[PDB]
Every structure is written in C-alpha cells, then in structure tokens.
Design a protein around this ligand. Structure first.
Ligand SMILES: O=C(O)c1[nH]c(=O)[nH]c(=O)c1F
Ligand SMILES: O=C(O)c1[nH]c(=O)[nH]c(=O)c1F
Ligand SMILES: [Zn+2]
Ligand SMILES: [Zn+2]
Ligand SMILES: [Zn+2]
Ligand SMILES: [Zn+2]
Ligand SMILES: [Zn+2]
Ligand SMILES: [Zn+2]
Ligand SMILES: [Zn+2]
Ligand SMILES: [Zn+2]
Ligand SMILES: [Zn+2]
Ligand SMILES: [Zn+2]
Lengths: 362, 362
C-alpha cells in the first residue's frame, strides 16, 4: 500500500547555524527534513557569521557534521570582497550563492561589475546560484552569457520570471531554475488569512495569475526546493518582520496532493526533487536510501509542524493527501511515523565523498 | 593526471543475443562497452528471436545474466500482436521500443493505430522509445500527445528532426531524444571513403548541414548513445548490406576529443552519458563504479577496435585525444589498458535491483 521513493533532495534550506539568535539549527532542521521525506539538503550561506570565507566554511562544516541528521552540502556566499579568494575551498561547497536583491550587509553586492567578477573567478565547472527577482533574472542571465557559463535561478515566483527563463531556454541558454511550494500553493488571496507579518517572504507571494503561470509552465521548472526559512512567530508578528516561511515538513505532502489530483505526475515530482537536483549540483547518490509514503491518508495541516523550531506554518488549514511513513538513510531507519531515529551527527558532507566531487578537466 | 568520471550509460546497443548468425554476443559486446568507459547498457529487442513476448524476454534475461560483463537492462519490442499483453513483464524491461520505419517482419507495425494501441496499453509510467525518422518523428509525437504521455526519440540524425523536437520542447511537450556519434562525427562527405556498403546505416549519414545543426542545437539533445549495431565486413560489403555501425569503443574517445577542442564541456558530456540516461529511463546508480580517462594521449583510430566482433569501424583514420585507462564496476577492476578483467556473467540486470524499479502510483 506504500509507495517507495528515492531519497529526495532539497537544494535550498536555511538552517540558521552558525548563529545564536534563531531556534533552528542543523539538528532540528534536518529532523524536519527527514520528516518531510528529504535525505539530503543544501544549506544557504546567510548565517551569522555568513559563509563568505574559508574560516567560516570550516566552522560551518564541523557544526553540520556534528548536528546534521541527514546528508548535506554547504553553499558559499558571494560578497563584495571575496571574488577570486575562494578557489581553494570552492570544490568543497555545494556551489556559490549570489544575493542580488535584498540581503544583509555582508552579502550585498553594490554593482553588476561585482557579479561579473564572481562569474569570472568562481571555477567554471562549479554551480552558481542566484537570488534574482523580476528584472534581476534578466540581468544575471546577461552576466552569465558575457562570461559564457550557466546559472541556476532560485525560487522563481512570477509569471514574468518563468516566461523570461522559458524564452532563454528556447534560445539554448544554460539556465535552470527552482520553484518553492509557497509560490505554487499560496497567492495574494491568502494574505487576508496570513496577515502582513506572517505573509512576508522574498520573493513575495504572487497573484493568482503568477501561480497559474508557474503551473502552466511546469516544463520550464527544473527543481522544487523548499526555501525553508525559519523564523519564529515572535519575529513574523513583530514590527520589522523578517521574510521567509518554514517548509521542509510541508513540501512533499503538498506536492503529493497535487499528484493525486492530476496536476502533475509522480515522475514530474521525482525529476524535480531527485534527478534534476542531482545533475544540476552534481550531488552523489545515497546508497540504501529511500522514502515510503502513504497516498491514502487525508489530513489537515496544523498550526505548526512537529519538528521545525519555527513553530508555525503558512499552510495551516490546507487539506493534503500524502504522508511520509518511513525514511531509510544509508541503511539505517531515520524516521518512522513522527519519530526521528538517527541522532545529530549521523549526516555527512556529501562533497567529501569520492562520488561527490564535481568532475573537472585537469 | 587522470580524470575520474562516473559510470557511463549507453541506452542504445544491439548485442545480437539471442541469435546464431552474428559474432557479437553479450560477453563480447559488454567487453567493448567496458573498453569504451561504459558500465551500463540497454540492449535493443531486434534479436533472433526478437524480444516481443515474455518467453523471449525470459530467455534473453538469462543469456545476459550469464554473459554480460557490465550491468544491463533489456528492452521489449512492440509488435503487431503484443499490445496489451506485456503488462506483467513490462516493469522488468528497460522500456518499450517501437520500430516505426524499416525493420524485419516481427517488429513491423503496419498502421499508426497500432502505435496508438501500444501507447494506450503500455504502462504510462514506463519508458517508450521510438526509431522514428523525418516525418515519423512528428507522427509519433502526435500519438504521444493523443495518449497524453512522453516519448523518447532514438538517434536523431537530421536538421529536420532536431528542429521539430526543439519546437515541441518549446511548447512544453514531454519529448526527449538521443544522438549517436556517427551523426556528429561523420557526414555524406565520408561516404567516398566508406563506400556504399560500409556507409549503410539507419538513420543514414546526414549532410554537413545536418551535422552542423545537431552541434548548434546541442541544448536540445538529452542523451548520447552509440546505437552499437555490429555487423561483420562480410555483411557490410555484401550484396544486401545491413545497416549499422559498431560504436561502443569509439564513442567516448570521439566525444572527449570534442571536449578538448571546446565543442562542448565536460559537464555537457556527462549530462548526456550519465545524468540524463538515469532520469529518462530511471536507471539506478552503480555503487563503487567509476571510469578513469587520459585526456593527453593523441592516437589514430585503427581499422578495427580490439573487442567488438564487428571487426571494423567507420571512424578508422580519425585522430582522437582521450583514452579509457581504467574502469571499476561495483568495487572490482573491470578494465585496464586494453584488458577486460571481469568474466562473462559479472554483469547484472539493474531492473531487478530494489533501486532499479520505476516508481509508480499504487
Ligand atoms: O534567510 C531568510 O530568512 C530569507 N527569507 C526569504 O523570504 N528570502 C530570502 O532570500 C532569505 F534569505
Ligand atoms: O539492428 C541493426 O543492425 C540496426 N542498424 C541500423 O543502422 N538502424 C537500426 O534501426 C537497426 F535496428
Ligand atoms: Zn532567496
Ligand atoms: Zn533562500
Ligand atoms: Zn529570523
Ligand atoms: Zn554529476
Ligand atoms: Zn562526482
Ligand atoms: Zn534504430
Ligand atoms: Zn538501434
Ligand atoms: Zn548483421
Ligand atoms: Zn528515477
Ligand atoms: Zn527506482
């Protein structure tokens, strides 16, 4: 009665470690990942301190190796000062992340020339990923063409963005992209329920026409990724609400509900949560790793999922059909019906595996 | 000095077993595969007898398990009589192959209605592959749309075909395709050297404009595959020359030469010989499996490669830069500098592995 899936990959998560101000860490975030059927995560570099140099990467590597319950890779972050300085550690990271719109001071790039410098100095065979909204998508595509290499666009959220990427792909340009579940299953219509605090996210929630454009152009979407961005309700309901939603535990149930409704096929889902993440970021296989899901149980998303320390969710009240029953990670039972059974530190840095290095010419 | 590649996959080979008239068999063909850096092959069903029913599949399965030196999956072949009869064995095959142009009597389909019947009865989650030339590509795409499922087009060889597939992909249609090395590295200009016998292949060799269109539209090509079709020179130079080239041992050296010349990147190559074959046919990973190549040695392709029993090659005289030095298959040294070190029967049917079944809804 259960369906066996491969180990699913989430290439866009914020686990807030290193850092001292948030409740989420590698241990709680990867517990949430396992409960969502996710056995490998790529963690973003906008931590405190941000992962913008080799010492910060070394610290984060050890914190994750000690806390992670599933396997992982860590992004490096582009800064106004580190272009040309990351060559010796670049291969050990998931890739390079550029924050091209709003971000905090250490990751801010003040000029497209700084984008160009990163595209020119980052090793050409390694992934580059960009937070790029609206016209910024076109701008970074231009920089990628000027430097003759590929780029991956995070969380595409608008009709404008997906149609631009569609046009670029039709001209044969090397661009891939990812879409997050809140931009497929939430819209402006939900802001009345969520309110202006909880509803804050970047890219912002789109119109009904944005959501319909993403579904209509599913063929253009290479990956799904949660953009798990945990903040507590104390932050979201405060005077300066930070943007972001938690999403590791809800993403697969939401997408399996869409499969059961015929909105996409099981294959469409597995291309975007397994095969394409593997090939875009050259993430290695996980031996003896699989997820068992139950597609019969209908349940309502509660006010908070059990594991993420965010302790809230914007999908509260939505009806879903699909449950993660069991996760096996490298031969060990990692999750069964609401209980995580692997300790912090079970997870490993996949870039240190022999099959986890990105191939390159000598 | 050596470059480590993952285990490469060739999704289109003819190994002539079962059969009694050709010299190639599973043991010699998979030896040729290993020498070409290929650790997994998918074998086509136009054998003698053809794999068009469960008893023929059962025989071929055991012959391959006893003779194969690398891992494999076996295609089923569509016939005018077997639509609706393959449901119980379909999941054990690589996929279903339709011969929509020239073929021998048992695999001939006399009507598009017979194509429709196969698209309607073959399980919707399992791969369908088609030999479809020129307008036949458009026709089978129409049948795929009428039945609301995907199709993979074998050995695309013409500007006409790749531009049609490009247009279909731009409308979001689920079509993938493969291109063989002889349609990238040989053209009509080589028929003077090859002659009308050796030059016989289906799809036929294209014009210089066909070859240039395939390279210009590399973004449209999902996979490379050899279409290894061994015939001896006694057949090729006879009165009724059968179509086909051997190609397992030459494909990777040819493509690595193009990489060294900047015609495509190493990543472009590995998407088309590893990642995309995996995701289109849902082929499982091979643990502890990798290929070591030497990109410095320049050599001239001889009159015949050492292993294929075809004992000739159409690429004789071409200069290449790139050599397979070592292949490791599931922890065992399989090939080193011209010596195959795994015996017949080392290879396994990947569809029998737990990770090798195609996911499906209950
Ligand atoms: O780190 C976060 O919380 C965050 N939240 C968002 O909504 N967009 C971001 O780009 C981001 F970095
Ligand atoms: O089996 C063969 O030899 C063969 N040779 C070709 O050139 N085209 C085919 O479609 C084929 F089935
Ligand atoms: Zn972002
Ligand atoms: Zn993010
Ligand atoms: Zn916060
Ligand atoms: Zn890879
Ligand atoms: Zn690798
Ligand atoms: Zn063919
Ligand atoms: Zn063939
Ligand atoms: Zn023959
Ligand atoms: Zn698969
Ligand atoms: Zn599988």
């Amino acid at each position: 009665k259960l369906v066996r899936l491969p180990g699913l990959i989430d290439v866009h998560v914020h686990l807030r470690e290193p850092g001292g101000t948030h409740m989420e860490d590698f241990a709680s975030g990867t517990a949430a990942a396992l409960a969502g059927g996710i056995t490998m995560v790529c963690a973003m570099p906008n931590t405190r301190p941000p992962i913008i140099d080799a010492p910060a990467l070394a610290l984060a590597q050890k914190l994750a190796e000690a806390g992670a319950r599933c396997d992982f890779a860590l992004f490096l972050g582009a800064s106004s000062e580190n272009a040309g300085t990351l060559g010796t550690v670049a291969g050990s990271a998931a890739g390079l992340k550029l924050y091209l719109n709003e971000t905090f001071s250490e990751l801010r790039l003040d000029s497209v020339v700084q984008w160009m410098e990163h595209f020119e100095t980052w090793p050409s065979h390694l992934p580059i990923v960009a937070h790029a909204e609206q016209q910024t998508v076109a701008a970074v595509l231009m920089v990628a063409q000027l430097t003759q290499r590929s780029v991956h666009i995070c969380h595409v959220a608008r009709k404008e963005e997906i149609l631009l990427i569609k046009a670029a792909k039709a001209r044969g340009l090397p661009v891939t992209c990812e879409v997050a579940p809140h931009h497929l299953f939430l819209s402006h219509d939900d802001l009345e329920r969520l309110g202006p605090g909880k509803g804050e996210v970047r890219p912002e929630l789109g119109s009904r026409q944005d959501v319909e454009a993403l579904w209509e152009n599913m063929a253009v979407i290479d990956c799904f990724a949660s953009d798990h961005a945990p903040h507590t309700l104390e932050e979201k309901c405060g005077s300066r609400p930070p943007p972001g939603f938690p999403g590791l535990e809800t993403m697969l149930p939401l997408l399996l509900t869409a499969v059961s409704e015929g909105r996409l096929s099981l294959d469409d889902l597995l291309q975007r949560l397994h095969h394409n993440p593997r090939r875009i970021f050259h993430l290695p296989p996980q031996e003896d790793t699989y997820v068992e899901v139950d597609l019969e149980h209908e349940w309502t998303i509660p006010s908070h999922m059990p594991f993420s320390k965010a302790h809230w969710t914007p999908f509260e009240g939505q009806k879903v059909k699909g449950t993660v029953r069991r996760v096996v990670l490298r031969g060990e039972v990692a999750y069964i019906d609401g209980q995580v059974l692997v300790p912090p530190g079970y997870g490993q840095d996949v870039r240190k595996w022999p099959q986890g290095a990105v191939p390159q010419l000598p």
